[PDB]
Curated annotation (Swiss-Prot), chain A:
<comment type="function">
    <text>Mitochondrial membrane ATP synthase (F(1)F(0) ATP synthase or Complex V) produces ATP from ADP in the presence of a proton gradient across the membrane which is generated by electron transport complexes of the respiratory chain. F-type ATPases consist of two structural domains, F(1) - containing the extramembraneous catalytic core, and F(0) - containing the membrane proton channel, linked together by a central stalk and a peripheral stalk. During catalysis, ATP synthesis in the catalytic domain of F(1) is coupled via a rotary mechanism of the central stalk subunits to proton translocation.</text>
</comment>
<comment type="subunit">
    <text>F-type ATPases have 2 components, CF(1) - the catalytic core - and CF(0) - the membrane proton channel. In yeast, the dimeric form of ATP synthase consists of 17 polypeptides: alpha, beta, gamma, delta, epsilon, 4 (B), 5 (OSCP), 6 (A), 8, 9 (C), d, E (Tim11), f, g, h, i/j and k.</text>
</comment>
<comment type="similarity">
    <text>Belongs to the ATPase d subunit family.</text>
</comment>
<protein>
    <recommendedName>
        <fullName>ATP synthase subunit d, mitochondrial</fullName>
    </recommendedName>
</protein>
Curated annotation (Swiss-Prot), chain B:
<keyword id="KW-0375">Hydrogen ion transport</keyword>
<comment type="subunit">
    <text>F-type ATPases have 2 components, CF(1) - the catalytic core - and CF(0) - the membrane proton channel. In yeast, the dimeric form of ATP synthase consists of 17 polypeptides: alpha, beta, gamma, delta, epsilon, 4 (B), 5 (OSCP), 6 (A), 8, 9 (C), d, E (Tim11), f, g, h, i/j and k.</text>
</comment>
<keyword id="KW-0496">Mitochondrion</keyword>
<dbReference type="GO" id="GO:0042407">
    <property type="term" value="P:cristae formation"/>
</dbReference>
<keyword id="KW-0066">ATP synthesis</keyword>
UniProtKB/Swiss-Prot annotation, chain C:
<keyword id="KW-0406">Ion transport</keyword>
<dbReference type="GO" id="GO:0005758">
    <property type="term" value="C:mitochondrial intermembrane space"/>
</dbReference>
<dbReference type="InterPro" id="IPR005294">
    <property type="entry name" value="ATP_synth_F1_asu"/>
</dbReference>
<keyword id="KW-0597">Phosphoprotein</keyword>
<keyword id="KW-0472">Membrane</keyword>
Curated annotation (Swiss-Prot), chain D:
<comment type="subunit">
    <text>F-type ATPases have 2 components, CF(1) - the catalytic core - and CF(0) - the membrane proton channel. In yeast, the dimeric form of ATP synthase consists of 17 polypeptides: alpha, beta, gamma, delta, epsilon, 4 (B), 5 (OSCP), 6 (A), 8, 9 (C), d, E (Tim11), f, g, h, i/j and k.</text>
</comment>
<protein>
    <recommendedName>
        <fullName>ATP synthase subunit 4, mitochondrial</fullName>
    </recommendedName>
</protein>
<comment type="function">
    <text>Mitochondrial membrane ATP synthase (F(1)F(0) ATP synthase or Complex V) produces ATP from ADP in the presence of a proton gradient across the membrane which is generated by electron transport complexes of the respiratory chain. F-type ATPases consist of two structural domains, F(1) - containing the extramembraneous catalytic core, and F(0) - containing the membrane proton channel, linked together by a central stalk and a peripheral stalk. During catalysis, ATP synthesis in the catalytic domain of F(1) is coupled via a rotary mechanism of the central stalk subunits to proton translocation.</text>
</comment>
<comment type="similarity">
    <text>Belongs to the eukaryotic ATPase B chain family.</text>
</comment>
Amino acid sequence: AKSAANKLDWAKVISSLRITGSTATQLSSFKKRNDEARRQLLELQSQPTEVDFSHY
Amino acid sequence: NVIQDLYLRELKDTKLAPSTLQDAEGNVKPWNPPQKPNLPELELQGPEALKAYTEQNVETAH
Amino acid sequence: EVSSILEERIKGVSDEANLNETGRVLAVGDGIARVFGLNNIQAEELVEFSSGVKGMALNLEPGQVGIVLFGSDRLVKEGELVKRTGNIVDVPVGPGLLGRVVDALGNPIDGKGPIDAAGRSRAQVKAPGILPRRSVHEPVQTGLKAVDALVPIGRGQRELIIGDRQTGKTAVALDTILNQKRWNNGSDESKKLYCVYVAVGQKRSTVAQLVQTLEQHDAMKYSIIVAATASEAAPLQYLAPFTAASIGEWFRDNGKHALIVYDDLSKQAVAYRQLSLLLRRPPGREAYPGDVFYLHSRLLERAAKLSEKEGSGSLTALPVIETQGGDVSAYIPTNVISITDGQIFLEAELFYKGIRPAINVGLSVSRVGSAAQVKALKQVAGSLKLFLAQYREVAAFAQSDLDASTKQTLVRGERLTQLLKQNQYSPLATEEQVPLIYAGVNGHLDGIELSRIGEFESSFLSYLKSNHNELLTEIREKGELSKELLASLKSATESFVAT
Amino acid sequence: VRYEASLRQLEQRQLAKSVISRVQSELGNPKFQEKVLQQSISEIEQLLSK
């Protein structure tokens, strides 16, 4: 699932907690989470390509 | 009686009032196409970035 | 074609028979035609003028019959034929009125075509008696956590929504309608409240907003909006709740459930005032007509939870009264307060202090109340009533050297108050009310920072849905919290708090 | 669709004022005389049915 990717991500953010000199690796990961969450809402926002021509 | 008179008069002497499809076009938003199919730019293409990154952050994990 | 529809309409006119009683207006002033004729007129009978204006005959005087014009005075003129429709005020009632915005006459003011109705029933029909009712025992959840717990709402019962002017009183009400969608979606007729919103004196702009919000939340398919707008004349305004009630009665008669929201009787009052004063009928207190008590009482007693002999049905009601300067002292508020069985008192100060719903818990009461509370919800919110009561008392202590006990009350109280904030026009399911309140009761929320309460809430819900939507489904379906569930729930809250 | 509905309302109103013109034509005709007779005989039938 998407949850596998995200679980490994947030676990790794908290692993990245346990390592220093990697203070912006997690910020890149956060961005990856953001856009991942963006594409699902992009997809949910969708207007189906076809025009309505049955009713409309 | 009067019903018949009106019915007849009304129907006969003008059924529909004039209308023109061409005039309608001005008053409605016209279809216009999306511009560009678009292709995403090749993000971080090649090891130019990698060689840079390995050097840039040779930062260890403490 | 435009021609064909017109052709059908002209074709649909044809002939007539004897106009039973003509009248001739003697004098028309102030929408009070005084008619000579109409000898055999029935009281408050509908009469049709030459102008096509309709009227009622409130005064049947010893030689003139004082028609009250439903229309504007401009159209009526002296000496007019006043045909006698011969049917006392009745409105179509049936099942088709669901999703139809109709005015008092029943004419769709949204043009959703001729009403499908199973009867036309009089709007003066008298309420069911003592023995034709059986005591309330069926909740109606409003999806507002505070309403459902602090002042639980039953069926066939009436409680005020009495509060300060334009505090979005209609919003508090509208929320209830939205929550009825969840139960409505279900197939069980037990789970079907067919709401009726009665917009009295409400501007057409307001009704446009009403219409769109209801359509937006897909509510129209169990909603009826009886609309008597500001423009609509004082007979319509007067008869508007009466008309609405009749529609509700049909549902009630079918033994179904429904919720009729009279908003606001304050404008109903004004209309009766206008009628009476203009008809020169004896004036009374606060320049409201002498029988205003009688009017309000007639309307408000129609709402009834029927008996099992009458195949238990209901017509839950929620009158809305607009207080002028918060004066419960005022004559129209005092009367209504007496008649109703419970009050919910929205308070402007709270609204300003950002508490929305701005219900003032102290001045909200239910006299049916906890009798029709969900058993689960009852269990997890006895504590809540007491805590808030204490929070109120210890409120003024919020100015330094404060006892540990008082400080404990304050932390618990502030967090609870924050918890009971809700974003209006989002109702919350009972299966999600029950967890949130449980947490507060177990005081695990006391620890959570005030600023973080909002974030906590949504997170707890998502966490519960991820962690165990089995528990939630159990809560929904069993409706009674078993010791094992209460155990699990406490654990769940603890676990959630830990993250 | 929006303009289509608007145009229908406009057509109906055009034909409405045309109906007023036909009403004036009807009241011009000695159909104005002849239909009084029609009303008279119809009322004779009606009033006899009472």
